[PDB]
Structure formats: structure tokens, C-alpha cells
Amino acid sequence: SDSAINVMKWKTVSTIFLVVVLYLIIGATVFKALEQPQEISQRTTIVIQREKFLRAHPCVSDQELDELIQQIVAAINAGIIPLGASSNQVSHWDLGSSFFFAGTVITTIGFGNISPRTEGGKIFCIIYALLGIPLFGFLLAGVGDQLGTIFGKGIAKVEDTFIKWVSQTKIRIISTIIFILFGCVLFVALPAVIFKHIEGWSALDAIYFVVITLTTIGFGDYVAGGSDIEYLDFYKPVVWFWILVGLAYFAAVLSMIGDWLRVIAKKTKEAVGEFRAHAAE
Amino acid sequence: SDSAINVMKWKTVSTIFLVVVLYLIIGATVFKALEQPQEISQRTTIVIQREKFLRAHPCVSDQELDELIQQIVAAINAGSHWDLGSSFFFAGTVITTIGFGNISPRTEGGKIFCIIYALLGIPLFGFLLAGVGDQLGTIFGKGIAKVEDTFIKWNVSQTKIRIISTIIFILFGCVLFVALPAVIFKHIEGWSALDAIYFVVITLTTIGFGDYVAGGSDIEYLDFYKPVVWFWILVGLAYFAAVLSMIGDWLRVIAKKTKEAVGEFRAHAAEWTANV
Ligand SMILES: CCCCCCCCCCCCC/C=C/[C@@H](O)[C@H](CO)NC(=O)CCCCCCCCCCCCCCC
Ligand SMILES: CS(=O)(=O)Nc1ccc(C(=O)NCc2ccc(Cl)cc2Cl)cc1
Ligand SMILES: CS(=O)(=O)Nc1ccc(C(=O)NCc2ccc(Cl)cc2Cl)cc1
Ligand SMILES: CCCCCCCCCCCCCCCC
Ligand SMILES: CCCCCCCCCCCC
Ligand SMILES: CCCCC
Ligand SMILES: [K+]
Ligand SMILES: [K+]
Numbered sequence: 001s002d003s004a005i006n007v008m009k010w011k012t013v014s015t016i017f018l019v020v021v022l023y024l025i026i027g028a029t030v031f032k033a034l035e036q037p038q039e040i041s042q043r044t045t046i047v048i049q050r051e052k053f054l055r056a057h058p059c060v061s062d063q064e065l066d067e068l069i070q071q072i073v074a075a076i077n078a079g080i081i082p083l084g085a086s087s088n089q090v091s092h093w094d095l096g097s098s099f100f101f102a103g104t105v106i107t108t109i110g111f112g113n114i115s116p117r118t119e120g121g122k123i124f125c126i127i128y129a130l131l132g133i134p135l136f137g138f139l140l141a142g143v144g145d146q147l148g149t150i151f152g153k154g155i156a157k158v159e160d161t162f163i164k165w166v167s168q169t170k171i172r173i174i175s176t177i178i179f180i181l182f183g184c185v186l187f188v189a190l191p192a193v194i195f196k197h198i199e200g201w202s203a204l205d206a207i208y209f210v211v212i213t214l215t216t217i218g219f220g221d222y223v224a225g226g227s228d229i230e231y232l233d234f235y236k237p238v239v240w241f242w243i244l245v246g247l248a249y250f251a252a253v254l255s256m257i258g259d260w261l262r263v264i265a266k267k268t269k270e271a272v273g274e275f276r277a278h279a280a281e
Numbered sequence: 282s283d284s285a286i287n288v289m290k291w292k293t294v295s296t297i298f299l300v301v302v303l304y305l306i307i308g309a310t311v312f313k314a315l316e317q318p319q320e321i322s323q324r325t326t327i328v329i330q331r332e333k334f335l336r337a338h339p340c341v342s343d344q345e346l347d348e349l350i351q352q353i354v355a356a357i358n359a360g361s362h363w364d365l366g367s368s369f370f371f372a373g374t375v376i377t378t379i380g381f382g383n384i385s386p387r388t389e390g391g392k393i394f395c396i397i398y399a400l401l402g403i404p405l406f407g408f409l410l411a412g413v414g415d416q417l418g419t420i421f422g423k424g425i426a427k428v429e430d431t432f433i434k435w436n437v438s439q440t441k442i443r444i445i446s447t448i449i450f451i452l453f454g455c456v457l458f459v460a461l462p463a464v465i466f467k468h469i470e471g472w473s474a475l476d477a478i479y480f481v482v483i484t485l486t487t488i489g490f491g492d493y494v495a496g497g498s499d500i501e502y503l504d505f506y507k508p509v510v511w512f513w514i515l516v517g518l519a520y521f522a523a524v525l526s527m528i529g530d531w532l533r534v535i536a537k538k539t540k541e542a543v544g545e546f547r548a549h550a551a552e553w554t555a556n557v
């Protein structure tokens with residue numbers, strides 16, 4: 001019976017599908033609730049600023065203004081600073097930023113603040129990713145291994161002193177707590193504090209940057225080292241290390257959350273079986 | 282000796298580390314070679330456009346323009362982006378970790394919800410993507426049961442036909458998941474043939490720069506287009522997940538082959554020089 005388990009599998013996949021479809025719907029409405037209003041008030045008060053310079057300069061064709069703004073937004077994607085009071089410019093593809101860029105490719109973070117424009121840079125970026133993503137996966141695996149054996153030494157010491165008058169499977173709970181607590185300190189709390197000072201971000205934007213980056217979502221709305229400010233350069237290589245170890249950390253954290261869902265799925269699947277078989281006595 | 286294996290482990294990690302560090306250095310120089318000039322020609326021809334706009338419109342003083350560009354840069358930080366369907370898109374870019382970033386939350390609440398929505402959605406979507414990989418795997422296993430029967434009752438036999446099979450996977454795979462969709466993006470999105478394949482790889486590898494986005498521009502789209510792209514992504518992500526994993530196993534093999542070739546080169550330089 002080979003197709004007996006395959007029919008059981010497709011039943012599992014399709015239910016997970018519908019839960020994903022419905023999880024996307026719930027999230028969609030919650031983001032639309034949170035983000036539609038602040039969008040409208042900004043898109044109306046930008047038409048307000050529009051008309052203040054639409055009619056205060058009639059001698060501009062005013063059909064070429066919205067063509068001007070296209071030619072600025074089209075060129076702002078490359079990272080321009082089109083100003084006369086600041087016309088000398090730092091490079092976005094210098095010795096170190098293309099090193100950053102290559103990092104966003106293999107880590108699949110892909111902030112996108114810097115992206116290739118040449119047809120050659122795109123063809124190399126395709127090849128660089130198809131090889132670099134598997135390669136970096138081995139490094140990130142070993143970093144997970146090394147960081148695992150360090151925590152294994154830690155709980156060998158802590159699961160010895162917490163042996164009072166003790167069960168094996170309940171101290172597993174105590175261990176995962178100290179992993180989450182210490183983990184959020186070294187990989188979320190402490191770095192975000194450093195970003196809050198150095199990057200000048202808010203306390204929320206820093207943690208937001210941490211989570212968006214280490215989950216490899218990589219929106220790119222906030223990027224460490226993305227401004228020109230001063231950059232000790234003590235700073236940027238520490239951030240390379242943070243990412244290398246922080247990605248390994250969320251990889252385990254996300255995997256833990258996945259197993260929790262597996263458990264909650266079993267508990268809720270049997271609760272519905274309970275609710276049915278009772279049906280009010 | 283428990284620390285004897287751990288030292289063997291750290292020696293494995295550190296070599297992989299240096300291969301990654303040196304892979305980043307090669308890439309950095311190659312991108313700096315490919316993208317430094319294209320940057321200069323655009324920075325010079327954007328100063329051309331700027332002083333062109335003061336002369337071809339004497340109306341505009343040089344002081345108003347710097348105020349205009351601040352008001353545009355300020356407006357780039359927000360600009361409907363959050364309508365009924367695009368926040369559905371957005372939620373997709375979160376759980377898939379593609380995260381194009383053309384749409385990103387601005388409210389402090391939308392950021393906090395995005396943190397919660399991701400920490401729960403990414404594992405959830407992983408299970409879906411795992412089952413999609415399973416199902417799509419058993420489909421192709423049915424296919425190679427029928428194709429490894431007609432090529433295995435005649436000419437050259439087993440252990441070299443693994444190679445032929447994985448080529449069939451890559452060849453048809455690139456058709457259904459890279460070639461065919463990129464053709465559809467080329468027409469509907471108006472992208473070049475290169476940009477479409479560029480979009481495909483950057484999206485299905487979950488890099489997702491966001492420099493090109495399907496359905497991201499303001500165009501009349503057919504009703505079937507965007508939902509087919511969801512299906513493409515659902516099944517295409519499962520495809521590169523296997524493809525990337527294959528490439529990973531190739532590197533393991535190549536690493537073994539190059540590790541023993543160095544042992545060869547050493548063992549001959551050894552007893553060539555031992556001969557005096
Ligand atoms: C496209 C960007 C160019 C990146 C090319 C980087 C390749 C770097 C040169 C390979 C040798 C690395 C240093 C030597 C390490 C060995 O002592 C060691 C065993 O002793 N090998 C490995 O650890 C395992 C290392 C095996 C890694 C093989 C990576 C496969 C690259 C395939 C690219 C083919 C291009 C052909 C022209 C170079
Ligand atoms: C404005 S710029 O883009 O043109 N210049 C730079 C921008 C960023 C960095 C950098 O290294 N940030 C830390 C970092 C490292 C690796 C990875 Cl993968 C991600 C991150 Cl955030 C360097 C130069
Ligand atoms: C300014 S906008 O908000 O209107 N831009 C948009 C861009 C894309 C879409 C959309 O549905 N694309 C198909 C799709 C689906 C899921 C995933 Cl994960 C990725 C992709 Cl590309 C909608 C709007
Ligand atoms: C933050 C959004 C949370 C969304 C939680 C959705 C919960 C959906 C529960 C689905 C229950 C299905 C029962 C199937 C049992 C056979
Ligand atoms: C059409 C231009 C293609 C340029 C990409 C080729 C890159 C050559 C490989 C470099 C290895 C060191
Ligand atoms: C058959 C592949 C579906 C996406 C075009
Ligand atoms: K933009
Ligand atoms: K991204």
C-alpha cells in the first residue's frame with residue numbers, strides 16, 4: 001500500500017494549504033487596518049504639497065513636473081544624491097559595499113538597497129547566488145553546530161546544579177527557556193541597543209531590523225551601515241559576525257516554533273475530535 | 282576523547298568559513314568591476330539632467346529645487362499600496378521570506394504585528410512548502426519510474442543513468458519553473474528576457490531584492506495573472522529548494538574530489554623530491 005500513505009499525505013498538505021490561505025487573509029486585513037489610514041493622510045498631504053508648487057510656478061509646463069519626479073525616482077533606485085549644495089558623492093559599489101552586496105545574496109537577506117543594473121552584473125548575480133546560497137548553507141550549518149556544542153557545555157553545568165530531590169523530560173523545559181532568554185539577549189536585545197545608538201534608530205526599529213534581517217526577510221527599509229554617518233569600522237565587521245551567528249540562532253528558533261505548531265496542531269486536532277464526540281453530552 | 286572530534290569540527294567550520302570569506306572577496310571585486318562604471322555614467326548624466334532643468338526652465342530657481350528633492354525623498358519613504366490585495370501580497374513576502382520590500386510597514390503597530398506575523402508564519406509556511414515538495418517529488422518519481430524503464434532495457438546500464446535522470450530534472454525543471462514563467466513575465470510585465478529570468482531566480486531563491494516585482498507596476502492585469510503567480514511561487518520555491526540542495530550535494534562531492542587531488546599532488550611532489 002504505497003498510495004495509501006500518499007492519499008493520507010495529500011490530505012495533510014491540503015489542510016495546511018487552507019490554513020496558510022486563511023493565515024494570509026487574516027494578516028492581510030490586519031496590515032490593511034494598520035497601514036491604510038496613515039497611507040491616505042500622507043498621500044493627501046503630499047497632493048497638498050504638490051499644488052503649492054504646481055501653481056506657485058506656472059512657467060513650468062506642469063506636465064513635465066510629474067515627468068521630472070519619475071526621472072528622480074527612477075534614478076533614486078541607483079542611490080543618487082542629486083543636489084548642488086552636496087554634489088560630491090560616496091560610491092555604492094566601492095570596495096566594501098559590493099562585499100556587503102555579495103553578503104545579501106548568499107544569505108538571501110537581500111535588502112535590495114544596492115542591486116545590479118548592468119546585464120553582466122545580473123548574469124553574474126544569478127550564477128553567484130546559485131553557487132553561493134548552497135555554499136553559505138554549509139558555513140551556517142557549522143556555525144549552528146559550533147554554537148550548539150557551546151550551549152551543550154553550558155547545560156551540562158546547569159543541569160547538574162539544578163538536580164534537587166528531578167525528572168528528565170521536565171528539565172527539557174528549563175533548558176529551552178534559558179536558550180530563548182540568553183538568545184534574545186545576545187542576538188536581539190544587545191545588538192538592537194547598539195543599533196539604536198550607532199544608527200540612531202528607535203528602539204522599535206532596531207528590533208524590527210533585527211527580526212526582519214535574521215529571518216532573511218530583508219525588506220531593506222532599514223539597513224545597518226546604510227547611511228554615511230561616521231562608522232567606526234569596529235562596527236561593520238562586528239555586524240558580519242552578528243549576522244553569521246544570528247542567522248544560525250533564528251534558524252533554530254524558527255525551527256522550535258515549527259515544532260510547537262506541530263504539537264498545537266495535534267492538540268487542536270484531537271480537541272475537535274473531543275468536541276464532536278460529545279456534542280453537548 | 283570528546284574534544285578530539287570537536288577540534289576536527291572547528292577545523293571543518295573554519296575552512297568553510299575561509300571559502301565563504303574568499304567567495305565574498307571574489308564576488309565583491311567582480312561586482313565592483315561590473316557596477317562601478319555603470320554607476321559613474323549615471324552619476325554624470327544625472328548632473329547633466331539637473332543643470333539642464335535649470336536652463337531649459339529658467340522659471341525655476343536653484344533654491345526651490347533642493348526643497349523639491351527633499352519633498353520627493355521624503356515621499357519615497359512612503360510612496361494604493363495597502364489595498365485589499367496588496368497587503369495579501371505583503372503577507373506573502375513575509376512568510377516566504379522573499380520580502381521584496383516595495384511594500385513595508387510604516388506604523389509602529391504594523392512593525393510589531395509584522396514581527397509576530399513572521400515568527401509564526403515562516404514556520405507555518407515551511408510545512409506547506411514541505412508538503413508541496415513531497416507531492417511534487419512523488420509526481421516526478423512516477424515520471425522516472427516510467428523513464429528509467431525504457432532506458433534500462435537497452436544501452437549502457439545503471440550507475441551512469443543517475444546522471445541522465447538528474448539532467449531530466451534540471452532540464453524540464455527549468456522549463457516549467459524558469460523558462461516558461463519568464464516568457465509570460467516578458468510579455469505581461471514588459472521586462473527584457475534577461476530581467477525576467479533575473480526576477481525568477483532572485484524571487485525563487487528568496488533573495489528578493491525587489492528591483493523587479495511581478496504585479497508591482499501600475500498596469501491593467503488579467504484576473505488570472507496574480508493568482509497564477511502565487512501558484513508559481515508555491516511550486517517554484519519548492520523547486521529551487523531541491524535545486525539549491527542538489528547544488529549543495531555537488532559541492533560536497535567536488536570538495537571530496539579536490540581534497541583527494543591535493544593528496545595526490547602532495548604524494549607525488551613528496552616521492553618525486555625524495556628521489557635525489
Ligand atoms: C563564481 C565565483 C568564483 C568562486 C570560485 C571560488 C573557488 C576557490 C578555489 C577553490 C579552492 C579553494 C581553496 C582550496 C581548498 C582545499 O585545500 C580544500 C581541501 O584541501 N578544499 C575544500 O575545502 C572544498 C573547496 C571546494 C570549493 C569548490 C567551489 C566550486 C566553484 C565552481 C566554479 C567554477 C569556475 C571555474 C573557473 C575558476
Ligand atoms: C549604503 S551602502 O549599501 O552602499 N554601503 C554599505 C552598506 C552596508 C554595509 C554592511 O556591511 N552592513 C552590515 C552587513 C553585512 C553583511 C550583510 Cl549580509 C548584511 C549587513 Cl546589514 C557596508 C557598506
Ligand atoms: C504597489 S503594489 O502593492 O500594488 N505591488 C504589488 C506587487 C505584487 C502583487 C502580487 O500579488 N504579486 C504576485 C505575488 C504574490 C505573492 C508573492 Cl509572495 C509575490 C508575488 Cl510577486 C501585488 C501588488
Ligand atoms: C495572527 C493570526 C492568527 C491566525 C490563527 C488562525 C487559526 C485557524 C485555526 C484553524 C482550525 C482548523 C481546525 C481543523 C481541525 C481538523
Ligand atoms: C555578458 C557578461 C557576462 C559576465 C559574467 C562572466 C563572469 C566570468 C566569471 C568570473 C570568474 C572569476
Ligand atoms: C506550469 C508552471 C506554472 C507557472 C507558470
Ligand atoms: K523605491
Ligand atoms: K529581501
Ligand SMILES: [K+]
Pocket residue numbers: 108109110216217218378379380487488489
Ligand atoms: K529575502
Ligand SMILES: [K+]
Pocket residue numbers: 107108109215216217377378379486487488
Ligand atoms: K530569504
Ligand SMILES: [K+]
Pocket residue numbers: 110111112113218219220380381382383489490491
Ligand atoms: K528587499
